[PDB]
């Protein structure tokens, strides 16, 4: 007989789809820009289920979750700077000079006096300030200085009570969608996983905005891996060994207040008190030697060519420098010395990377929403881990003239996208939609 139609309902059928995810945060709420607020509290039980005999393909380089989370971070960053004060009337001609008098922060600072409008809208008065030299450009043949980004974009300072600390954020799917997770010890990037398990929520992701180096990230568990774009521009290296990095800015900063307008309270770097030593970062050279010597072979076995490095060319501190976010400060660090480890590993003491402080940031080179950093009073350090790098693929044997066999010329080591970090944490997860209807033939027949 024709085995008649049955309709089940507990039916596990997948369809690949795109939808909106949502928060899961740990219960640590006490404004810390990501705010731990209007954000779903986590479930105490991490609920996953294994899926044997499952052969599932999912692509890293087309993952919708990455663009979802980039748009989330951009909209959150925009919302967090909304109630703070604008810094429009500070654009004014600046009468500057040297403040007063190797490794001196005062040499990289200028003392600038200027007229500001008070709360009376008529009586301008002369106040003074200190600024770092990389936020000031010139006009004339004497002092006559411009505060930078008065022709490009508007600048708003941050509210001082906020913190830039990256909290962990889990992503979860709404009910009616599932999150497939691979569990292989390595993943090439775009193939079929074997040990696949579903899970209701991802692991914690700290939105650490940076470049040249991935910080506080997830480490691989057998060997350092090289997730490569299809020879497009770049390749994400994920180390096994976390490499410790410390960064320091010593001394205090006396902070004043200037009333620009009604409740428009500019914060001023009034004086540098404690120590004049520049901001610097410090890593262990042997660990970095092992990490680079591992990364060379991991790229070498796949690209079949012997690996070189090249110092980045002149230009944007998007690509020439490192870009931390330590406390309420923004470090631009000169890493053109640290990729030379044959010389560097001789010194058994430690190595030093010099860094510079920036107050004015056109945010993250993709948002560009001009944020004026509030001055942080205090002796400040921060330490973190080095887990990943964003290397750029070398230029082929058509652009460099000399041989590019055995001479893989990594002319830069950068990625300007904040998105590419977020590709290095969501290489495991796929959003699927359940189709619970089902149609089958069967023995029965309804009367």
């Amino acid at each position: 007989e024709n085995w008649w139609v049955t309709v089940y309902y507990g039916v596990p059928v997948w369809r690949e789809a795109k939808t909106t995810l949502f928060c899961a945060s740990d219960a640590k709420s006490y404004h810390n820009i990501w705010a731990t607020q209007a954000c779903v509290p986590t479930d105490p039980t991490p609920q996953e289920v294994l899926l044997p005999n499952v052969t599932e393909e999912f692509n890293m380089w087309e993952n919708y979750m990455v663009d979802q989370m980039q748009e989330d971070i951009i909209s959150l960053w925009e919302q967090s700077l909304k109630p703070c004060v604008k810094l429009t009337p500070l654009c004014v001609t600046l009468t500057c000079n040297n403040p007063t008098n190797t490794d001196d922060r005062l040499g990289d600072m200028r003392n600038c006096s200027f007229n500001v409008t008070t709360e009376l809208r008529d009586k301008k008065r002369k106040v003074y300030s200190l600024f770092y030299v990389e936020d000031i450009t010139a006009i004339g043949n004497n002092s006559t200085y411009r505060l930078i980004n008065c022709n490009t974009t508007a600048i708003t300072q941050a509210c001082p009570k906020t913190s830039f600390e990256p909290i962990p954020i889990h992503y979860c799917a709404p009910a009616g969608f599932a999150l497939l997770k691979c569990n292989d010890i390595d993943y090439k990037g775009n193939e079929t996983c074997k040990n696949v398990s579903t899970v209701h929520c991802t692991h914690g992701i700290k939105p650490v905005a940076t470049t040249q180096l991935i910080l506080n990230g997830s480490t691989a568990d057998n060997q350092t891996v090289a997730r490569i774009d299809p020879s497009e521009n770049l390749a994400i290296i994920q180390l096994k060994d976390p490499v410790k990095i410390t960064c320091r800015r010593p001394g205090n900063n006396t902070r004043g207040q200037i009333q620009i307008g009604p409740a428009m309270t500019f914060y001023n770097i009034e004086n540098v008190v404690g120590d004049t030593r520049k901001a610097y970062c410090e890593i262990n050279g042997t660990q970095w030697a092992k990490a680079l010597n591992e990364t060379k072979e991991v790229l070498r076995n796949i690209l079949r060519k012997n690996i070189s490095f090249m110092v980045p060319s002149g230009g944007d501190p998007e690509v020439t420098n490192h870009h931390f976010n330590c406390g309420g400060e923004f470090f631009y660090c000169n890493t053109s010395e640290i990729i030379n480890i044959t010389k560097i590993n001789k010194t058994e003491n430690m190595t030093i990377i010099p860094c510079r402080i920036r107050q004015i940031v056109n945010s993250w080179m993709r948002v560009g929403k001009g944020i004026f950093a509030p001055p942080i009073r205090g002796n400040i350090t921060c330490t973190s881990n080095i887990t990943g790098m964003l290397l750029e693929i070398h230029k082929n044997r058509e652009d460099q003239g000399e041989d590019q066999d055995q001479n893989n010329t990594y002319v830069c080591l950068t990625g300007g996208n904040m998105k590419d970090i977020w590709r290095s944490e969501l290489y495991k997860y796929k959003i699927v939609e359940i189709q619970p209807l089902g149609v089958a033939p069967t023995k029965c027949r309804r009367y």
């Binding site: 024709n2 085995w3 008649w4 139609v5 049955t6 309709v7 089940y8 309902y9 507990g10 039916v11 596990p12 059928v13 997948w14 939808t19 909106t20 995810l21 949502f22 928060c23 607020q37 209007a38 954000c39 779903v40 289920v49 294994l50 899926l51 044997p52 005999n53 499952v54 989330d72 909209s75 959150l76 919302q79 709404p174 009910a175 009616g176 599932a178 579903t198 359940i434 189709q435 619970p436 209807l437 089902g438 149609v439 089958a440 033939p441 069967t442 029965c444 027949r445 309804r446």
Partner: protein, 120 residues
């Protein structure tokens, strides 16, 4: 939080014949996703409602299975050697046809014979 769904898909890798049944920013995300999940559930209740199966998990019907409906062989092989992901490929091209034949054969073929053949 939906707290309403069934079928947590755990035994999907096992054989289909032996599974046999299982059992601000984020504020706008919630207010969108809840409505999406509710409407997607009610659509399943509408396809289940017109087949005379509201409240059941497993139904039978009177509709015969055509031997052109998918690649047809011994059906015991279909139960013993497939999973739902494998059978769902062969389900397609036959979606709207069966989903109209069931709605014809339940709400019209049974109800007319209930009301007219039986006078009361």
């Amino acid at each position: 939080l939906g707290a309403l769904f069934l079928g947590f898909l755990g035994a999907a890798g096992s054989t289909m014949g032996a599974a046999s049944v299982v059992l601000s920013v984020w504020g706008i995300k919630q207010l969108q996703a809840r409505v999406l999940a509710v409407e997607r559930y009610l659509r399943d209740q509408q396809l289940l409602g017109l087949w005379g199966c509201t409240g059941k998990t497993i139904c039978c019907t009177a509709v015969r299975w055509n031997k052109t409906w998918g690649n047809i062989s011994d059906y015991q092989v279909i139960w013993n050697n497939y999973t739902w992901q494998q059978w769902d490929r062969e389900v397609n091209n036959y979606t709207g046809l069966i989903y109209t034949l069931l709605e014809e054969a339940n709400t019209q073929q049974e109800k007319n014979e209930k009301e007219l053949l039986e006078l009361d």
